[PDB]
């Protein structure tokens, strides 16, 4: 019995990773993803300029799960290409590292010189979009024109295979639209299904306040909440993206959430809030969660119930 | 210290009811509403001709909420007119009659038929933007242009104050899209937030399978997984449509959620999953919650706290 997958050309020893934004900000933080035992890693979304972020606090979670509202905070391009160039250990484990530019013109440059160090080390491009473009537009991957528009010149400038964020939809007509735009570029060779739920208001009784200073409260939704919207969009893009991979993010906390994301479709399998809240140690436990499901079940591998998920009659 | 509220030239015992569809399809349920200690009810959304509605099973519970692909199951409209213009007890609570019609010429039609059962009995239109997909088509509320179509062509056959159900929005662009649209139109009076999450996907793990039967598993989301959505959806038009109500719904289960809502901006709280999972006693329970929680924090009345939530700094 085994976790093992073989993807994009890379070595995985199981498919859990961290979601992009926990436990990667700093070197720290990514030599502490790297010792521990999650397949991958990712780092946080970067922007060409290091950034504070948004006022503290930004983060809360709660029985249910998180909201936040950080705002970008992150160390600049230049050190998360730095790390991917000269500190990561590839013998651990493969890196991705996660691009967020406010800009497509800023998404680009970044793309420029990453692919040097994409081609010769094997780091991972991840495309954040689900993120902002011009205030009081959309997010990028609401705006189908504008995600055409990013998608069209990151796979010029950078050239070689990358993947892409995605925020939850919620309407069939934009899983068969988003679908079509990522289905016009091969370059996409992984789709990560979901981002947080955006714009989401925690509101504490006691106090009769929001819980987090950014935006009058407002911030995206992880973990518990959004369990089923995440698999709904893994199972959407697995079945409308046949030559592309399926990364699964969204609620998971234990072996059995990893199992169902897999039957929905996911390859490799992100964790944000149960990772923030529990520590790396997170992985150990849903690895050996996950081998005791499929003992029971008689599966020996991920490809045999992958994307499995049985509809009813 | 009691919890009776005037809003709309309606005078309401209390802010609750139960939320569209649920408890409220046939004579019997309406009846049972009727019965109940809620403070008003509305009926299931209707269309012109009855609907079987889709195949079974189509509503499925968990500990943190459900999902349903029901369909649109009715008695036609012509059962709900019939309901509210000689069967209903007005003496006992208002009455909401809500329209789901599959076109915007289908909607017209009914409510010009309403119009004169509103004048003279007092029954209130809710119109249901939400309706089963159609294969290349965003949802109404999700496509600002059609949603201006639809209110406009519904105030002008109508012309009377009525409210419109709203699916929850994600983003803060789209929140004043939609506000602004809305705010277009002075019959509206009030804005009934959220209908279920969309799309949201239940897998079993035991059985490999998705639970309800319709949509290869797809349905709307309702519960706990939505509490925070549906209070960022109350609060974001409560704080942009000034001249209007806002009816809290999503993810109450008891009086500290509806106290949430009311603080959020609620002026009705509307219950479906905790209602449909726990039957019409839950209304005594939340009145005396709500009211328990006010007696502790000094509040006297709903309208000392309603939209009165606290940001920081
Ligand atoms: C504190 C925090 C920071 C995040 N920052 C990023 C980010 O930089 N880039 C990104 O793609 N997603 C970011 N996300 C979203 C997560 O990657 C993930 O998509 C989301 O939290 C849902 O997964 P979960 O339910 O396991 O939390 C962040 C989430 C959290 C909680
Ligand atoms: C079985 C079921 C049927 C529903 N049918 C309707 C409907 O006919 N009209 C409508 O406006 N909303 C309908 N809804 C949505 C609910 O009114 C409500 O907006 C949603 O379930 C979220 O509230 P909750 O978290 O309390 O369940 C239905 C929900 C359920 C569970
Ligand atoms: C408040 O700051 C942000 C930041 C982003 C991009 C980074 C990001 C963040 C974050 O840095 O806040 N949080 C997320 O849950 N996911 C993300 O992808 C998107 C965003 O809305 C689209 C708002
Ligand atoms: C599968 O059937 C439907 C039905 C409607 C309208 C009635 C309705 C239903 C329902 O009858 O399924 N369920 C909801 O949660 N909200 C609703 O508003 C919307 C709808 O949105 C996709 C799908």
Do not use: W
């Amino acid at each position: 019995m085994c976790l093992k997958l073989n993807l994009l050309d890379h070595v995985f020893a199981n498919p859990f990773m961290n979601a992009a934004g926990v436990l990667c900000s700093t070197e720290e933080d990514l030599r502490c993803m790297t010792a521990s035992s999650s397949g991958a890693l990712v780092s946080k979304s970067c922007t060409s300029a290091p950034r504070d972020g948004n006022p503290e606090p930004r983060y809360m979670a709660f029985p249910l799960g998180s909201i936040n509202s950080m705002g970008l905070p992150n160390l600049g391009f230049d050190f998360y290409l730095k790390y991917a160039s000269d500190l990561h250990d590839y013998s651990k484990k493969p890196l991705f590292l996660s691009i967020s530019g406010l800009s497509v013109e800023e998404n680009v440059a970044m793309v420029r010189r990453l692919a040097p160090v994409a081609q010769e080390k094997g780091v991972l491009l991840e495309l954040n979009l689900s993120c902002p473009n011009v205030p009081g537009k959309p997010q990028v991957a609401y705006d189908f024109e504008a995600m055409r528009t990013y998608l069209q010149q990151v796979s010029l400038a950078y050239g070689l295979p990358f993947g892409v964020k995605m925020p939850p939809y919620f309407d069939i007509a934009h899983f068969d639209t988003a679908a079509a735009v990522l289905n016009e570029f091969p370059l996409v060779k992984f789709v990560t299904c979901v981002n947080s739920v955006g714009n989401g208001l925690v509101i504490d009784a006691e106090s009769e306040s929001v819980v987090i200073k950014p935006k009058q409260g407002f911030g995206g939704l992880g973990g518990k909440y959004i369990l089923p919207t995440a698999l709904a969009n893994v199972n959407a893009f697995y079945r409308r993206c046949p030559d592309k991979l399926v990364f699964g993010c969204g609620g998971v906390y234990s072996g059995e959430d990893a199992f169902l994301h897999i039957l929905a479709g996911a390859s490799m399998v992100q964790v944000g809030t149960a990772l923030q809240e529990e520590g790396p140690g997170i992985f150990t436990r849903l690895e050996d969660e996950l081998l005791e499901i499929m003992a029971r079940k008689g599966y020996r591998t991920l490809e045999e119930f992958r994307g499995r998920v049985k509809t009813i009659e």
